[PDB]
Write a structure and sequence with these properties.
Two copies of one chain form a homodimer.
Chain A lengths: L1 H12 L3 H5 L17 H15 L12 E4 L2 E4 L4 H19 L24
Helix pairs in contact in A: 1-4, 3-4
Chain lengths: 122, 122
């Protein structure tokens, strides 16, 4: 769920998930996908695409087990869907962190997501 | 559109709309409605309901004219839906502004809007 996702992003990036990625670019946070504005945004793009593919569980609300072991998100062996969900979340948290170097505050508070160029299909 | 809306919110509240109301509470910013966390959130609640009554225009993207006259949002005539849209946006900007005094930064960055109690029907 967003609980785990939020925590992962926090654990990885060291950033407040909602603050730094709640309305970032065309893909981070709620809204759907749009043309990624940068690497950070594409993390979220990929992440949402990851969600799209998920069947059998709710990415937003379904809880799952993961742990923070040796500063690594380790998804619990939940079930197939929740594991994928966890891995989606882990991936984006890692991705967001990996792309903190190009994280652009200019993209941080995007009130204009619907005006993002349409996203390619996932 | 979110251009006018954001601008209205800015003009009324002085606040960066996406920062302060992009992810605030259960109702502000993208996402839908939820039980308002407070008066600010309830503005957005009312706003989103206001949107629900619109037909013939896209509240997110359809631009419309309004002027900032005597520190008042004055909706241009536009057309019926855009006028009504503008009035929705005006109302929430005003409401957001009116409720700055209880604007709670602890609701500002809600990564968990899906976990908000379900909104009442509009």
């Amino acid at each position: 769920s967003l609980f785990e996702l939020g925590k992962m992003i926090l654990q990885e990036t060291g950033k407040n998930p909602a603050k730094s990625y709640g309305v970032y670019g065309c893909n981070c946070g709620v809204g759907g996908r749009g043309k990624p504005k940068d690497a950070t945004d594409r993390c979220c793009y990929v992440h949402k695409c990851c969600y799209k593919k998920l069947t059998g569980c709710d990415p937003k609300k379904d809880r799952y087990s993961y742990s923070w072991k040796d500063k690594t998100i380790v998804c619990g062996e939940n079930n197939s869907c929740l594991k994928e969900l966890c891995e989606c979340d882990k991936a984006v948290a890692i991705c967001l962190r990996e792309n903190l170097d190009t994280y652009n505050k200019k993209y941080r508070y995007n009130y204009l997501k619907p005006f993002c160029k349409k996203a390619d299909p996932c």
